[PDB]
Write a protein that binds this ligand. Sequence first.
Ligand SMILES: O=C(NCCCN1CCC2(CC1)OCc1ccccc12)[C@H]1CCCN1Cc1ccccc1
Ligand SMILES: O=C(NCCCN1CCC2(CC1)OCc1ccccc12)[C@H]1CCCN1Cc1ccccc1
Ligand SMILES: CCCCCCCC/C=C\CCCCCCCC(=O)O
Lengths: 278, 376
Amino acid sequence: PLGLKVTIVGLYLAVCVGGLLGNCLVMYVILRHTKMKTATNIYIFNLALADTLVLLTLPFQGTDILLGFWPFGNALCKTVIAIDYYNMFTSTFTLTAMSVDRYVAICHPTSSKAQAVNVAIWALASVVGVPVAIMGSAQVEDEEIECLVEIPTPQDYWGPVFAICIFLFSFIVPVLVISVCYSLMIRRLRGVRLLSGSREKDRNLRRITRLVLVVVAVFVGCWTPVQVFVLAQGLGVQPSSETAVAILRFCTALGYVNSCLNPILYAFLDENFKACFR
Amino acid sequence: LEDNWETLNDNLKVIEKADNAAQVKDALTKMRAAALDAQKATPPKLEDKSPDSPEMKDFRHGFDILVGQIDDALKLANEGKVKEAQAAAEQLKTTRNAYIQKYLPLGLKVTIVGLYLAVCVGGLLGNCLVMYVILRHTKMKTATNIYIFNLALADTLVLLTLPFQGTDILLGFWPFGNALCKTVIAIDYYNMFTSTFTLTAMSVDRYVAICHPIRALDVRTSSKAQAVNVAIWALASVVGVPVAIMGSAEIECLVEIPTPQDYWGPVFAICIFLFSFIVPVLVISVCYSLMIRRLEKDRNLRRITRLVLVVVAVFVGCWTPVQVFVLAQGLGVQPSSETAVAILRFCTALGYVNSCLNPILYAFLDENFKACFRKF
Ligand SMILES: O=C(NCCCN1CCC2(CC1)OCc1ccccc12)[C@H]1CCCN1Cc1ccccc1
Ligand SMILES: O=C(NCCCN1CCC2(CC1)OCc1ccccc12)[C@H]1CCCN1Cc1ccccc1
Ligand SMILES: CCCCCCCC/C=C\CCCCCCCC(=O)O
């Protein structure tokens, strides 16, 4: 309703301000402040960059929720939709990369290469990003103009097709790989007390590995409700009650909250980052 | 006690290996003090019994008779008859195997295995029969039946493992190696997750039919239900494959918890509990609850809805005891009595009985299925 969406928007504004502050701060620290351009941080940079982009759209999406329509035209409609998908894909793919990086460190004890991967990650993402941007538009159909992605005819076929594919390749499979990485660490680590190197430097590996795992946990936690719902919507399951809509609005919000959460996680679970703040 | 037990073995083998009376008299000494420090201890098997219960009292008695022979063996050694003191060691090894060993059944596990064999045969027959009927026999590929197909498929896989698990129970170890160990563990988890997730999907499907009778026709196409099954096996693998990797194989088939176990134990224990069982069931509850408030031949809708609910009920009924126990095991609560183990073995069995139950439910509560089973 009128007051419950004000809640949603106020929530966005909060996420927006804190998010940009946090992520921009992170990007700065890694970029110029210090030579802490490590494999993991270059991937973290990639996450912050993505979060930044999507955070910039909350002000726009926020007004659409209030007005009940899209008053920014087509150009910005396509722009927003692209980012939204770019966000999801670059996030998971980057997390996966970070996970493999971790596993390599643990079992096989450069930033340039991590930088290369980020490129490949944005290259893969665009395979869905650009296409969706083209398909997306703001179409005054009946009653109201609105921003959305157009599903080809018949929708009863392509709906499920894109619904399933995007579910698997944007979320499940990446998460699946991530699981394998950590599972393999587990079997490797067993029997490794202060082993595989020297005491002084091991805690970092453990601490940096612990970091990557929490970020993944937190991400998966924030975007799973939305992923399933969106999946269901693709199959034709549509919400038609105030409560249904509300829950959806909040789970969509809950996902966007993930963007501003990362910086705080780095602050609490990463010594180096914890130092550059205060 | 497991410590003292080995302190007795090494000092029992040092005896008849010795070439000096001093090594014997010394070994018998070490061996004696251990029998006393082990007589006071308590075996795991009887950590739930009183210090004066027959089972417990007759465990400290085994250590009396034993110690008595170690005292005797020492008199021979002191009297100078050192050679026939070694002879007394072969006499001890006997006392060790008969009285105290068992404290570290045959016919009740035969029951368990025979139970598996029964569930296995009937299960496969029932489910395979179901998959056939839906697959080829008829164009009864409805949204609900495509989900039922998914359940049967899962039941089929897990049913195939009962023959294998059944022998492990008999032999008391896993004789099939690692490859099959990993394979079996995966299925077992795949089963649990695929089952609940499918039931949830079926429940939502039902709710949609009840509340959206207009848009359900286009929505509850089998093609879409087919797509869901794919997503269900995709979600399941997020735990299935990882567990397969962690799983491996006296020697036994089990999943390895990372160090420290006192932390990760509860972590996986709680997460698997919530996401494999509770949350799915929670959603299901919402679906029916919403039907309640909302509520030609709608008899089908009612009958098909009634069906889904019974299948859920029966499933939850069969897997709740195990879910809680397994949850408790994750928190460190371990069974250490014959009764404890037995109850666990049967509750684990009870779960596997659920696999063969479904086909019968369809036969009794579904007209269409009830008709084709008459054919065969
Ligand atoms: O709907 C809107 N916002 C919410 C978008 C939420 N997104 C949906 C897409 C997202 C991530 C979360 O869903 C799961 C998933 C898996 C893989 C990639 C991307 C996704 C409308 C109304 C307001 C502005 N407008 C933006 C928009 C329009 C059409 C399509 C997307 C966004
Ligand atoms: O232990 C065994 N069988 C019983 C397996 C019972 N499982 C335990 C796990 C299960 C499902 C039921 O319970 C809770 C739960 C929550 C979520 C998913 C799956 C589960 C051993 C002994 C001999 C055969 N062998 C098979 C096996 C070994 C290790 C792991 C699984 C199976
Ligand atoms: C979260 C920040 C909230 C900002 C509130 C936005 C206020 C918008 C008020 C009036 C906009 C009306 C737009 C009508 C234009 C319709 C035609 C068109 O958009 O091309």
